[PDB]
Amino acid sequence: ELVYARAQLELEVSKAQQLAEVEVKKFKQMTEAIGPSTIRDLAVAGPEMQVKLLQSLGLKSTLITDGSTPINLFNTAFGLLGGP
Amino acid sequence: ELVYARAQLELEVSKAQQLAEVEVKKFKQMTEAIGPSTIRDLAVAGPEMQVKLLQSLGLKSTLITD
Amino acid sequence: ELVYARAQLELEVSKAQQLAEVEVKKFKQMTEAIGPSTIRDLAVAGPEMQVKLLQSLGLKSTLITDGSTPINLFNTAFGLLGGP
Amino acid sequence: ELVYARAQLELEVSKAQQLAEVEVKKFKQMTEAIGPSTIRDLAVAGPEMQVKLLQSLGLKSTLITD
Amino acid sequence: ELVYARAQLELEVSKAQQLAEVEVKKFKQMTEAIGPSTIRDLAVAGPEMQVKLLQSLGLKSTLITDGSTPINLFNTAFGLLGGP
Amino acid sequence: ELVYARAQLELEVSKAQQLAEVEVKKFKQMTEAIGPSTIRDLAVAGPEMQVKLLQSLG
Amino acid sequence: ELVYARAQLELEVSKAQQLAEVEVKKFKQMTEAIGPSTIRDLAVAGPEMQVKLLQSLG
Structure with a gap:
């Protein structure tokens, strides 16, 4: 038995190599x-x-949020500009 | 058994290597x-x-509420 | 009996070592x-x-809260920036 | 009993050590x-x-209410 | 009888000591x-x-309360910072 | 009788020690x-x- | 008996090593x-x- 399993192990390593x-x-x-x-x-x-698409607007924004579920600023920044 | 098990161990380690x-x-x-x-x-x-992305919002001032 | 349990204890410590x-x-x-x-x-x-992300904004914020069950400031800070 | 119990105590302490x-x-x-x-x-x-995290909220003024 | 109770009392104090x-x-x-x-x-x-956490913010708060069921200031102070 | 308990005390205190x-x-x-x-x-x-440290250090 | 487990310990530790x-x-x-x-x-x-890098680098 075991020698056949060694002979397949040489072949498995050969295929991998x-x-x-x-x-x-x-x-x-x-x-x-x-x-x-x-x-x-x-x-x-x-x-x-x-980035270049927002840096060209040079915004001056103000934020109002809830505190425990606050607004994700990345979804904001992409959302002005299409996330999907 | 212990001879076959030592041989199976050597086989497995040789694959892992x-x-x-x-x-x-x-x-x-x-x-x-x-x-x-x-x-x-x-x-x-x-x-x-x-960093550049969030900087580009230009957030001057903010308010947090309940 | 007891000597076999001692012989198992020597083996157990040998394994643990x-x-x-x-x-x-x-x-x-x-x-x-x-x-x-x-x-x-x-x-x-x-x-x-x-940290370096919020530090880039250099925020200037006003906080309004409840008293007995107020806003968690860590969930606020990560929440602007994705908690999940 | 007290001989076996002294011997079991010695065994247990030897394991714990x-x-x-x-x-x-x-x-x-x-x-x-x-x-x-x-x-x-x-x-x-x-x-x-x-500390650096919460400092970065830049809280100027605050209001607590019922 | 009572001599046995004295003999147990010596043993109880011996264990306690x-x-x-x-x-x-x-x-x-x-x-x-x-x-x-x-x-x-x-x-x-x-x-x-x-303490060192809240001391870093250097708050300048204002309070509004009901008078007979007022806001607990310790639950306020921890609540900004996680009570649980 | 009570000599057995007086001996069990030596054993219990030996285990505690x-x-x-x-x-x-x-x-x-x-x-x-x-x-x-x-x-x-x-x-x-x-x-x-x-928790992370006690997991890290066995 | 116990000699077999004393040998199995060498085998398990050899596999670990x-x-x-x-x-x-x-x-x-x-x-x-x-x-x-x-x-x-x-x-x-x-x-x-x-994820992208570990996909990109085989």
Whole structure:
């Protein structure tokens, strides 16, 4: 019995080793294709535009709230500008 | 029994070793490809953007009530 | 009878000793792998950002409350900023 | 009876001693590894962090009512 | 009869004397193990933080009350800060 | 009769004595590991810390 | 009898000892592939980032 289970364990590790290399190869090439500094840009610039879209108004707001269930300021800030 | 159990233990540990080795190598080579300072500079953004966002409400004065 | 219970007590303490050593070995190696100053940092920096967020607004607030069952100021402070 | 009871007392105290010795050594070597000043400086944080939090509401004036 | 009651009374006092010494031994050794000025600190510092918290806000409050069922100022002071 | 109870008293007091020393020893040794100068200002850290720390330190 | 349990203790502790080292090795190596530096800054990024990053990094 046990030696057959060892022979499958060598195969299980072989499949894991080779597929992990195949994915890493694809991932490295995909991150030489797009210049990797612009991956910082691709993640930041969407949400950073939703900053530039409020900073252009230069608001001077006043807040009135309940105290134990108060207004979520993030849902406020997006809500002026479309959350969905 | 104790011979088979020692052998099953060695089998299980040998799997745990080799799959951990693969998962480290994968993690290492992907993190090498991006550069840890690029991961850092993404991670810094989330907080800093939320700061600029809430600052942009321009809250001069406030009132809290029951 | 009693000597078998003593022989089980020697075995029980042997188990308790050896497991406690395995746990301490793992714990010391973990706390040498991460820098211990960065373990101080990891616990503070999460709730520190929830300070740094409100500190950016520099609020100037007026509070109206009930007396016998008043407004919790911690639920107020997180509530502007997402409690859940 | 009193011989067996003295022997059972001796057995129990011998267990209590040895499990306490293990639990001290465990506590000692973990607290050695973190450093008492690291435990201190985490414990100091909770209060000071809550102070900075509530200070940041900037409460100028207040009103209590029935 | 009554001689047996005297003999039990000696035994009752013997138990009371010994258990009282055993507890006092533990109590003295405990209060040498942790420094007794730290036992002064331990009881004060919990409530001290619930002072140091409100003292940081430096409130300038106004009160309105019913006269015959007035607002408890301790439940007010904790209530801003979590009573439960 | 009463000699048995007078002997059971020695046994009960022996159990009280020998367990009290184990707990005192444990308390002194834990206190000497986390020295009193950092048991002070651990009491203020509040429940969420105290639970997290006692889970963290076995 | 009890010799079998005295042997089972060696086996259970051997399993504890050998698995503990594999997880430490993995943790030390991942915590060197990225430093302890850059786990700071990652700790504040919040859940939407941390989930996205652990998906993004294999």
